[PDB]
Amino acid sequence: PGGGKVQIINKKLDLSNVQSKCGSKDNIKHVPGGGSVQIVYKPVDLSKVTSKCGSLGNIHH
């Protein structure tokens, strides 16, 4: 079974305001290997995010 190609030109400029930031929780992702087997068995997200702010954005006074 034939191998494929993945290419990712991820070009990012980030000037954002975030209180709490988490990355992805993807299970199976970017598989160009031919005849390969990926299993994710009973993956669970029970995570808790609590965020409190008075004010968040920019002023530009």
Among all chains, which residue has been given the structure tokens 């030109």? 9
| 31 vs 29: CA distance, rounded Å | 6
Q: Which two tokens stand for residue 3?
A: 């191998």
Rounded to a whole number of angstroms, the minimum distance from the CB of residue 7 to its own copies is 5
Instruction: Count Cβ atoms within 10 A of the Cβ of residue 50 and give its class: 0-12 exposed, 13-18 middle, 19 or more buried.
Output: exposed
- 41-60 footprint of its own copies as x/- string (CB under 8 A): xxxxxxxxxxxxxxxxxxxx
Residues 7-26 that bind its own copies (CB under 8 A): 7-26
Considering the complex, what minimum distance in angstroms separates the CB of residue 31 from its own copies? 5
The CB-of-56 to its own copies minimum distance in angstroms stands at 5
User: Which residue ranges make up the site for its own copies (CB under 8 A)?
Assistant: 1-61
